[model samples]
Target: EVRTIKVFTTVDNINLHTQVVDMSMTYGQQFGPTYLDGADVTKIKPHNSHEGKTFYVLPNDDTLRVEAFEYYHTTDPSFLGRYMSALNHTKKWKYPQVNGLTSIKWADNNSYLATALLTLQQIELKFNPPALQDAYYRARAGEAANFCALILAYCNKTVGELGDVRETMSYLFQHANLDSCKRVLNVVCKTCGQQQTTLKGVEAVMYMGTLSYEQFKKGVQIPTCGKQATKYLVQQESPFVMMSAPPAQYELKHGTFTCASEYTGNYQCGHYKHITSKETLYCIDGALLTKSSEYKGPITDVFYKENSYTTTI
Candidate 1:
């Protein structure tokens, strides 16, 4: 059992400052007349929490050594501890080069949305097949298609100015995903299937999430879940949503996802040495949203400058 707790060491200086540390090891700090002007106590404690909160030892003499220990710490394990347990539990690995992409630094909500926005800002539009083109392809570029539209969708309301927007935009942009985007778009686009409500140009909505390549292979194929399967995140209450868990208790799935777009259903998505598979995708890493549904969440939508033409969408 282990727990992170703040431990304190008091120095007898006129400044009367106490040194606090969250130490996890059984270690000691030495104090003497030359070190600090004065000394009375060092403190720390953790037990049941049955693990007690720790307290440091107070040496009686002028120059004394203080040490600490955890008799019984909290039993709850770290999220990473449990996560890696699951990863190693499977105990499987074949390819090395392309597979180890996800690093332990993930597990962040800020980076996730920033990952979505930064790519849409640079990679998707600047490096892809299309250039100087209509907004459609960039709009539909898998990882952030919906994020951009949802981003653009916000400009019409009180946006007032570009900088003023971040305050409100942060609410929408951070941790945002496609399905929760419905409040603005109103309906999922029918590009892969059919549509009548006036969304003109079309582009591929590839390679997002864990759905097997067979269900909806990418770009052209109608998703096997069907056109109606599209959904937005519902936070806690809505039907269709994103994330392995709800937002507050967020967690993203890990694994090498098929960059394998499904349009070419002939080859199953996997580590195929023979053919050049459709290639690359991002959501599974802490790079983008994992859960999505075709409905709205419980939070109210805040709109500003929505009618404005230049979110650059």
Candidate 2:
């Protein structure tokens, strides 16, 4: 059976909600914007792995497949808050530039080290406290001496320590896909060749969590080494229900985009908002779009999995 997604030619006739003024809470809603600013849709960078295109993970679990588009959206509530760009702490960026593509590498070290460096940056900025800084170091990256050593390192060790290691990371982002990804793992990860065919699409779940592989390989009890929490924000309703709720319950316009599949060379540069049986949004690049709003661009009807989540938050 085929489903046809009709367009809303009479867009003005339909009622639209007023932009929910910044950071206000809606009582009955399932979710709302966690961030009030920063994810300027216009400025959000494309996935560096895709060489400037946002890649969406396909509907696969064991074998990961990806699709790319210039931009996309969804009114699908389940997908609304899924984009990771919304969580970025920086005002200037959305997606992390040099990390995971399909598996948007969790910055594996980025968060831990960001917690490290940014925390370290502050400790030096203020010679005012002692235990609090030490406490933060232990909680953030573990080991107070590492941060203490890091303190001197940044000042005196940039060229000798951090700088040398910084360039060594060049190979990390250079390879963003299938073979390139595995090759890096071959060098960095300690694998047991437990089985040749079982390459384990596990990386998509939690790539950097290999402190101990044997127990993880044994069967899969807690499976955290496989990581219940993951870096890439899509797929697997297991660890998180990231964007399982409907879009309406959450503020729809955060500048952080949601996405859908694409067709032959779409024309628009940003989001492609759609009105279907319910509501949907996505951005596709590749037509009438250049002709402006008078242009009618027909996007393929995309469907999303409906999900429910509990607030562990």
Candidate 3:
């Protein structure tokens, strides 16, 4: 029998909570090469390999799965607390026009590296103390030395220790308005908003977190709080859930959720009606959102995962 379906409009309501994972805890999360596995030398640049992202491993017995993210460069919590802007620069900016952008590429060397440097400098200005700076570097990016080296290269500093890398870097960093990146992000979010395929649609609801060919080929296991923890965020109780939900959805008011499948798209903010005796309560756990709220203070932790469900939306 065909199930009767009626689509109604509902305003999205966002209710977020903090899931604090201590850096010292180390339950099972480990580190490894992410999309940027081979992004050393000049072989890979920003917008190429996982330039703006980080990689990790989760142990399942002796075996493991890879987790990818654009969180901070490191896993240090203090760095996250003190230097969140550095970690969150990716979310704030998109295809920046350092030179200019035909499209948004994470490895868009000019803007990505420039933006990253500004992020680092922003942290240094706000926070003092070498320990915190070190922690900031620790929490944001693993190789502070590499970042410094990049800055040197950007400024033309470490080239045989000859030119004025710092002087050039200062001029570049100080002069250029990196706000273009944020503008690009805003444009994408607004364009996506017009589509009405937000977390409010059925097609997108079922398809958030399926693995990509590359991810699957490499056996990457994107981590989450797990489905058990994910259920509470939604209003409907459908067994099928969207997994590869981008964290940007939580930050962008009108961001579009894009993925390979309907599952990944819908899970971002998609709502589906549940087949039930009572039509009033038809939607799944997160189906109907009444309102959305702003997250004040700062986003201390950022993690990536693939959300899933056993049933239909």
**By the TM-score metric, which is better: model 1 or model 3?**
1
Off-target runs (Cα >4 Å) in candidate 2 are 1-89, 92-176, 179-313
lDDT of 1 by residue, 180-293 (tens): 222111223455533312121111122123333222212222234334434321112121221111112111122222121111112122110110111322332332233322
Q: TM-score of every model?
A: 0.18, 0.17, 0.16
State each candidate's clash count. 44, 21, 50
Against the reference, the lDDT scores of all candidates come to 0.24, 0.22, 0.24
TM-score of 2: 0.17
For residue 94, model 3's alpha carbon misses the true position, in angstroms, by 32
Candidates sorted by lDDT, best first: 3, 1, 2
Instruction: Rank the candidate models, highest TM-score first.
Output: 1, 2, 3
Question: Can you write out model 3's per-residue Cα lDDT over 1-313, one digit (the tens) per residue?
Answer: 2222211110000111122222332212322111122122122222322222332222222212111011222233223222222322222323322211111223212222432332333221222223334433532543332233323322432222322212333333332222211100011121122111123323322223432222221222332233221111222222222233332322211121111111112222322111111212111111121222322111111112223322221
* Consecutive 10-residue window with the lowest summed lDDT within model 3: 179-188
Tens-digit lDDT track of model 2 for 1-313 = 2222211111011222222221122211211232122132322222213222221222222211111111111122222123323222222212221111111112212222232222122211221123233433443442332232323222232211222111221221122122211111111112222212212121321223222222222322222233332221122222210111111212222122222122222232222232112123322121011112122233222222222222221
Over 4 Å off, model 1: 1-112, 118-123, 126-203, 206-210, 218-313
User: Cα lDDT for residue 258, model 2?
Assistant: 24
Candidate with top lDDT is 3
